[PDB]
Write a protein that binds this DNA or RNA. Structure first.
Ligand code: NA
Ligand code: NA
Ligand code: NA
Ligand code: NA
Length: 327
DNA sequence: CCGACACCGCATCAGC
DNA sequence: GCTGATGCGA
DNA sequence: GTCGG
């Protein structure tokens, strides 16, 4: 990835715009347009010299080109400078960094004078359970997880899962499975041969055991199929304790497990390609299944999948390691 | 010109 | 009390 | 905001 000294002023600007669209204007599609513009620029291996040059990249249109022209000539953007000094908008944007506070909650809070973390601390009674946990770990949740801590975390998850029942299958996916040197959270996919698409406490038993050994510390949400919560590695005596971390655990039917693992391994870019390719060979892939497409476009019934490689074999692609699924 | 821009599990609200 | 909608995060 | 039917 080209040094961000290249176009970092431009991509930072676009990302800041993206956030205000999402969190203040509640314009999720403009949020994503700015994100896509910023991504394509961040990978452009030349220092951009004009809006017209940037406009050639897919996802950069007339308006962002105009904004790049103004940034290059003046070193700033009038609209962005203004919105940053706006006390109401900057506060709404900021509050959304608390897990559980979205654009709607943030606007309600700022409306009633609640603008800072200290204001949230004073008003516990107006926070729901999720938002209280997000406040508690506000700083911890914004730190990344070094891969060595993810390995220590994996060790615990895989040990305790097998202890509940040695027939469970658990896989830590996300960028960690692709080999990333750091993670933002831990995404665990779980299955059991007794659970198929046409097969009730399989998830709870695992959560309970991880809570019993004091790895899981808090629960954001928990149902029959998805757990979302908080975990923390055990601290060695005297040594500073580790930050609390976000962990999700999903229970997936066995016949859909490897479609799940393939999907939640990613990357997002590799996933678009593989589904693009799959289409071009007569198959439709989603996170659950791969199905054949007839000539008139009618999807037939899901194909049996017993490994990730089964999916690749169907679409006439050679198996690619997680480490090579960057695109 | 103008619709798409992913889908869904869970917590919680809004309406009956 | 139930049912569907909405907010949130993925 | 951008793309494309
Ligand atoms: Na463009
Ligand atoms: Na938030
Ligand atoms: Na956020
Ligand atoms: Na056993």
């Amino acid at each position: 990835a080209p040094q961000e000294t290249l176009n970092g002023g431009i991509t930072d600007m676009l990302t800041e715009l993206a956030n205000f669209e999402k969190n203040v204007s509640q314009a999720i599609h403009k949020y994503n347009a700015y994100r896509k513009a910023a991504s394509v620029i961040a990978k452009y291996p030349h220092k951009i010299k004009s809006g017209a040059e940037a406009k050639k990249l897919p996802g950069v249109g007339t308006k962002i080109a105009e904004k790049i022209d103004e940034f290059l000539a003046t070193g700033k953007l009038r609209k962005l400078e203004k919105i940053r000094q706006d006390d109401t908008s900057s506060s709404i944007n900021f509050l959304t960094r608390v897990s559980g506070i979205g654009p709607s909650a943030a606007r309600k809070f700022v409306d009633e004078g609640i603008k800072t973390l200290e204001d949230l601390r004073k008003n516990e009674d107006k926070l729901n359970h999720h938002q209280r946990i997000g406040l508690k770990y506000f700083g911890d949740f914004e730190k990344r997880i070094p891969r060595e801590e993810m390995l220590q975390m994996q060790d615990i998850v895989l040990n305790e899962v097998k202890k509940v029942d040695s027939e469970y299958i658990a896989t830590v996916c996300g960028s960690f499975r692709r080999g990333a040197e750091s993670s933002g959270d831990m995404d665990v996919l779980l299955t059991h041969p007794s659970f198929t698409s046409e097969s009730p406490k399989l998830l709870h038993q695992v959560v309970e055991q991880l809570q019993k050994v004091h790895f899981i510390t808090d629960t954001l949400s928990k149902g029959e199929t998805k757990f979302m919560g908080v975990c923390q590695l055990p601290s060695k005596n005297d040594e500073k304790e580790y930050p609390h971390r976000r962990i999700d655990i999903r229970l997936i039917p066995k016949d859909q497990y490897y479609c799940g693992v393939l999907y939640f391994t990613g990357s997002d870019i590799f996933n678009k390609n593989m589904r693009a390719h799959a289409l071009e060979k007569g198959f439709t892939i989603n996170e659950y299944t791969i199905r054949p497409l007839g000539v008139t476009g009618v999807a037939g019934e899901p194909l049996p999948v017993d490994s990730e490689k089964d999916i690749f074999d169907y679409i006439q692609w050679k198996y690619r390691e997680p480490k090579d699924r960057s695109e």
